[PDB]
C-alpha cells in the first residue's frame, strides 16, 4: 500500500508508493470534490535512482488496456509518454493525455525525478475504464535498472522491456485534496532538479 509522504524537496504531500528492491518511488496527488471540482487530471511523481533506465506506471493496474506512462531523464531533461498496450508487447503512442513536465524534475546526479500532469487521463475505454472518484484503484509500476529509451531526446523513444513490474491497490479518496491547485502552482514553479 502507498503512504501519505511529505516531498522534502517541494514542501508538497504525495500518496507514495516506495518500492524497495527498485528504490523507486511512485507518487500521486487527485483533486478533490469541495474545492477544484473538475477532476479529469491528477499530479504524478516518478523518482528512482539517477542510473535507472525509465520509470512507468499503469493507470488500471494490468499492463493490457490502460494508460501507461512513462517517464526518464536524457542527460538533465526530463521527459514524459503516455502508451497503450493490448497485450503483453512494446506499448503504442496513446493520444487522448495531455502532459506537462513540472517543476523539481530532472536529475541531481543521485535521483531521476519526473513530475507531471496529466490532464484527460482519468476516463478510458477497456481495462478497468477509468480511475474511480471514490473507493480503491489498482496501479501499476514498470521500471527499468538500468537502461534509457533507445533514442532518448525523443518522448516516443522505443523502450527495452522493464525489468521490475507490479500492481498495488489504493484508496483513491486519500489521494483526493482540496489543496490539489496550490500543489499544482508549487510544483510548477520549483526549479529544476541541480542538487
Ligand atoms: C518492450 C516493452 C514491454 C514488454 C515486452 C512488456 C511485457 C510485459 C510482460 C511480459 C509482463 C508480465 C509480467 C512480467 O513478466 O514482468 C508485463 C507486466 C507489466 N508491464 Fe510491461 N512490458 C513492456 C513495457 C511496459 C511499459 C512501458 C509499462 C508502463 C510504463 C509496462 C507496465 C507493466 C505493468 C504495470 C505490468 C504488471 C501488471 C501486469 O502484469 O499486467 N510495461 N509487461
Ligand atoms: C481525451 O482522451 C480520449 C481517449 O481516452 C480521447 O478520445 C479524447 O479525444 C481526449 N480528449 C481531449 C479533449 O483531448
Redesign the pocket.
Known sequence: SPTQWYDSITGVTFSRFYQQDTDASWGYIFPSASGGQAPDEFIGLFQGPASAGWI???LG????NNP???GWVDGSTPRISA?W?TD????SIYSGPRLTILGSSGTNGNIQRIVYRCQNCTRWTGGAGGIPTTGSAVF???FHSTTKPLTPSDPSSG????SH???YGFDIGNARTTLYDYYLQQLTNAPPLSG
Open positions: 512507468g506506471n499503469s493496474g494490468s499492463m493490457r501507461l506512462l512513462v502508451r498496450a503483453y508487447a512494446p506499448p501499476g509500476w514498470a523502450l527495452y522491456r522493464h513490474a507490479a500492481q
